[PDB]
Symmetry: C3
Subunit: 223 residues, 3 copies
Amino acid sequence: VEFYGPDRALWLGPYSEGAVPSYLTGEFPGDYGWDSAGLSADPETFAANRELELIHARWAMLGTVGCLTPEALEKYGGVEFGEAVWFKAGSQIFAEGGLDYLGNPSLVHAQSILAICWTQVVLMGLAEGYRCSGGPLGEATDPLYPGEAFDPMGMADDPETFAELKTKEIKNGRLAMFAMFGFFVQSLQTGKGPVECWAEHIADPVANNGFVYATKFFGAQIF
Amino acid sequence: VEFYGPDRALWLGPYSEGAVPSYLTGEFPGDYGWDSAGLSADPETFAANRELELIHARWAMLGTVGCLTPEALEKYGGVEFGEAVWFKAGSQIFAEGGLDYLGNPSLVHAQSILAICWTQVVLMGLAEGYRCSGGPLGEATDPLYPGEAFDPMGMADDPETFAELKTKEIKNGRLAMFAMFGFFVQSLQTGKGPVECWAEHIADPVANNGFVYATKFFGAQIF
Amino acid sequence: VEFYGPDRALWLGPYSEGAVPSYLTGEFPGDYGWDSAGLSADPETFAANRELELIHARWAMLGTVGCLTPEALEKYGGVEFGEAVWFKAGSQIFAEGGLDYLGNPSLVHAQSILAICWTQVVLMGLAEGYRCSGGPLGEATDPLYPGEAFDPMGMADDPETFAELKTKEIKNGRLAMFAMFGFFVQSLQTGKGPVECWAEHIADPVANNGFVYATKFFGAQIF
Ligand code: CHL
Ligand code: CHL
Ligand code: CHL
Ligand SMILES: CC(=C/C=C/C(C)=C/C=C/C=C(C)/C=C/C=C(\C)C=C=C1C(C)(C)C[C@H](O)C[C@@]1(C)O)/C=C/[C@@]12O[C@]1(C)C[C@@H](O)CC2(C)C
Ligand SMILES: CC1=C[C@H](O)CC(C)(C)[C@H]1/C=C/C(C)=C/C=C/C(C)=C/C=C/C=C(C)/C=C/C=C(\CO)C(=O)CC1=C(C)C[C@@H](O)CC1(C)C
Ligand SMILES: CC1=C[C@H](O)CC(C)(C)[C@H]1/C=C/C(C)=C/C=C/C(C)=C/C=C/C=C(C)/C=C/C=C(\CO)C(=O)CC1=C(C)C[C@@H](O)CC1(C)C
Ligand SMILES: CC1=C[C@H](O)CC(C)(C)[C@H]1/C=C/C(C)=C/C=C/C(C)=C/C=C/C=C(C)/C=C/C=C(\CO)C(=O)CC1=C(C)C[C@@H](O)CC1(C)C
Ligand SMILES: CC1=C[C@H](O)CC(C)(C)[C@H]1/C=C/C(C)=C/C=C/C(C)=C/C=C/C=C(C)/C=C/C=C(\CO)C(=O)CC1=C(C)C[C@@H](O)CC1(C)C
Ligand SMILES: CC1=C[C@H](O)CC(C)(C)[C@H]1/C=C/C(C)=C/C=C/C(C)=C/C=C/C=C(C)/C=C/C=C(\CO)C(=O)CC1=C(C)C[C@@H](O)CC1(C)C
Ligand SMILES: CC1=C[C@H](O)CC(C)(C)[C@H]1/C=C/C(C)=C/C=C/C(C)=C/C=C/C=C(C)/C=C/C=C(\CO)C(=O)CC1=C(C)C[C@@H](O)CC1(C)C
């Protein structure tokens, strides 16, 4: 009634009349009528874009927590990681002693980047092949909402709550994608992790805003 | 007869027979039949691309004058700006004494970048909402040519002259967009403003061409 | 039977059922059913994309040989080029003595970058105009397979062998495009030519892999 149908919520709010393409009829989750570039005029291209958006969104929602958790644990929990900041976490594998999980030498204790890379290649290749075509966990009936084995708690057994939860999922996913783009740009510009940036903004908001580093083009002092 | 219809002017000149997509029938302004990438084969995507092109073009036409005027005034008019070149003009707000207009400390005299940014956010948000949906100045009857309040002098009251003026507008806009891409690349490469670059090419054209800085990839001396 | 039709080869192999768009019916060469982004849903956009892919592929097939040949000749043949590595070959024109072909001062012996650039502009403009619309060498009956003057040996006179050779061409071209992207990224990251990189990987594969330079973002040590 508010996120589906003709009377739904739109991206420009009260100024959305005429900013909504005719092919965005509020049928799919997250339909705020924002296709100003006309990249989803074709229904098949629209479906491909929806799948890409939802997959990017779920990956970004995992990534926000994965980038905040080690740095937050180091700053406020006392855990001594090798590199808590997310953009330096990969370089842990080259450090002496390897990549210890939670800073504990008896956990994971990875030492070879090649083994990690190729194990991930194999596992993720199988996983994405199953995503596209089905596998051990079931058949890919829906490209985005397979359910069954991926809804063990049965939170989507009811169609209206299913639609509401799809709206919530796509909205939190778009927020997390926005936050991950923010993480990328903040790492490029400030050179410090998101937790450090947040702790600095709340300390002196006026003097520690984003325009302090505005003279750099994504970290490059060109001028 | 020359910029509309089947006998119009095409992008490859005499070698255009067979390089013109069938959906570019010379109906809309600036139709030189250049869609080699097939990005406007969908009519709705074509309309979205036309709107994007015209808005980008009008912004670039404003930008050409906006980037040339302060630097030209400083170089040949004697006006003492804080930062005349366009790519350093933003940094004036961080300088001591703020951002004075025309170098006069009694004009504008901006001192806070947050105030500028958020005032612009509010004003431009309202302005673009009006562009999409209409507002105080009228109704968005046409996404690109609203007329009425935006044609006060009535220069588009004649359909033939209206089409000719639309062709002139789109051509000057494409030229301005090309020039602004040039401004961006020249700022990245040479590191000096467009007026300085122009004054240098006209001094020693052979020795001060664009290949002097060809060893830098958009300013970065990678190799 | 294996690269055309319904029983052809697919991009995800055994996990391709449901990963193939309905509009990729295995009619055109190189149809592995990989359009996950839905950029070729429109048939006209599909044709434009096929033309772009084949042209990029032929250019990359030329480019791989053109980038490997001078460096390989310098390393294993003894030819003394001014700059054997492909990403520095352009800067030979600025060196003292100009650009000598094969290092011989009696071959080409180019001295002006402007003459090279503008001669190439004229010649390539005429050549691409002919490609689009036909010219001295024939008429552009097909955008990608004109034949006639461009098949002098008559290797495409049999439709079955013609289809097989089209598949071979598109596959070798896609491999060459992949390799040219590899050349770009390796030049950005390592800073040395592809032949040097290959000679280093085969010397100490474990210690001279691609993760040694993983801390740099396309050559920039941002962190
Ligand atoms: C009534 C006014 C209203 C306005 C003006 C907007 C406007 C917007 N909404 Mg929106 N909304 C509004 C009401 C509402 N919205 C929403 C729900 C949503 C959603 C869910 C989303 C939006 C999004 C957007 C944005 C999409 C367009 C865009 O990206 O422009 C921005 C383009 C610009 C050019 C602005 C730049 C201005 C700024 C000063 C730039 C400064 C640049 C740097 C200083 C220098 C540049 C650096 C260079 C060198 C690289 C836009 C800001 C989307 C979004 O947030 O995407 C980002 C989005 O997902 N809205 C609701 C609830 C129903 C509203 C209720 O009233
Ligand atoms: C008869 C020959 C004729 C030819 C060959 C062209 C060709 C062109 N016209 Mg055109 N026109 C011609 C006659 C006419 N035109 C027009 C009206 C127009 C218009 C309005 C427009 C064109 C545009 C174009 C360009 C579009 C394609 C392109 O972008 O290629 C360029 C692609 C290349 C790969 C060329 C690069 C060659 C160069 C040597 C590159 C060197 C690279 C660097 C040195 C190194 C690379 C750096 C790396 C590291 C990043 C192209 C140059 C469009 C344009 O200007 O866009 C740019 C455009 O808007 N034409 C008219 C009037 C009716 C003609 C009349 O006869
Ligand atoms: C059975 C398993 C099987 C799997 C899983 C694949 C999977 C793939 N095939 Mg494929 N194939 C498979 C069987 C077969 N293929 C083919 C014939 C082909 C062809 C002709 C082609 C493919 C291509 C592809 C790739 C296209 C999707 C992609 O780009 O993902 C990759 C996306 C990722 C996100 C993977 C990244 C993982 C990696 C660990 C990333 C590491 C990141 C860095 C370390 C850090 C990031 C840097 C940052 C900072 C920028 C993909 C790897 C295409 C290709 O090669 O494109 C590249 C292609 O042209 N296949 C045949 C013959 C019929 C098969 C037979 O069984
Ligand atoms: C990528 C590439 C492109 C070459 C393009 C050429 C040659 C274009 C010619 C382009 C040629 C062009 C346009 C010719 C045009 C000729 C004309 C119009 C002839 C004619 C006439 C007229 C005048 C009487 C007029 C009448 O009305 C019609 C006609 C027909 O009678 C080359 C790559 C390499 O050369 C390097 C750089 C280095 C090497 O080591 C390796 C290789 C690979 C060889
Ligand atoms: C709508 C619309 C309409 C118009 O008409 C046209 C239009 C404007 C174009 C269009 C709009 C479209 C828009 C806005 C596009 C925006 C896209 C964005 C921002 C996408 C963002 C994606 C971000 C992702 C996936 C992040 C993943 C992170 C990971 C991986 O999971 C890790 O963190 C993994 C990780 C972790 C967890 C710990 C670290 O230490 C190490 C690493 C590996 C980094
Ligand atoms: C209306 C409404 C009603 C509902 O009831 C609820 C609701 C929906 C919530 C609500 C809606 C809310 C709406 C629409 C509000 C819109 C907000 C907007 C547009 C604000 C945007 C602000 C823009 C900013 C600060 C950009 C600053 C750039 C910096 C600083 O860091 C750079 O340095 C730039 C820079 C430079 C110079 C160098 C580059 O290399 C890197 C970068 C970072 C890009
Ligand atoms: C046709 C076609 C067919 C094929 O099939 C596929 C295809 C090839 C893709 C396709 C072709 C498409 C092509 C060629 C694309 C080209 C796009 C280009 C160059 C767009 C350029 C746009 C540039 C703009 C808006 C400039 C704005 C500047 C401003 C803002 O107004 C200021 O200056 C503002 C300003 C001023 C005034 C003072 C300064 O101090 C500070 C700042 C803030 C910078
Ligand atoms: C026919 C006709 C008839 C009508 O009656 C009237 C008409 C329509 C007018 C007329 C039509 C006219 C036509 C078609 C002409 C076409 C003109 C063309 C294609 C000219 C192109 C010239 C290309 C140039 C100079 C590029 C140089 C690159 C540099 C130098 O600066 C870099 O350093 C490269 C570089 C490097 C190496 C590092 C990167 O990081 C940055 C960059 C800058 C990219
Ligand atoms: C399929 C698909 C489905 C999804 O749904 C969406 C999707 C994922 C997007 C989509 C996938 C598409 C993909 C993977 C895109 C990839 C594109 C790539 C890698 C294109 C690469 C092209 C590279 C080229 C032309 C190289 C030419 C080199 C030259 C010039 O000939 C020289 O070397 C010239 C040269 C030589 C020879 C000597 C040197 O000294 C000097 C220079 C001038 C450099
Ligand atoms: C199944 C099958 C059956 C048929 O019968 C035959 C068949 C078809 C052949 C066969 C099919 C084969 C298949 C599917 C295999 C698939 C293989 C894959 C996915 C390989 C992936 C490996 C990924 C790698 C190494 C990435 C490493 C990144 C580096 C290292 O250099 C960076 O430093 C990353 C980096 C960083 C950190 C900074 C950036 O600035 C620059 C870069 C380089 C991006």
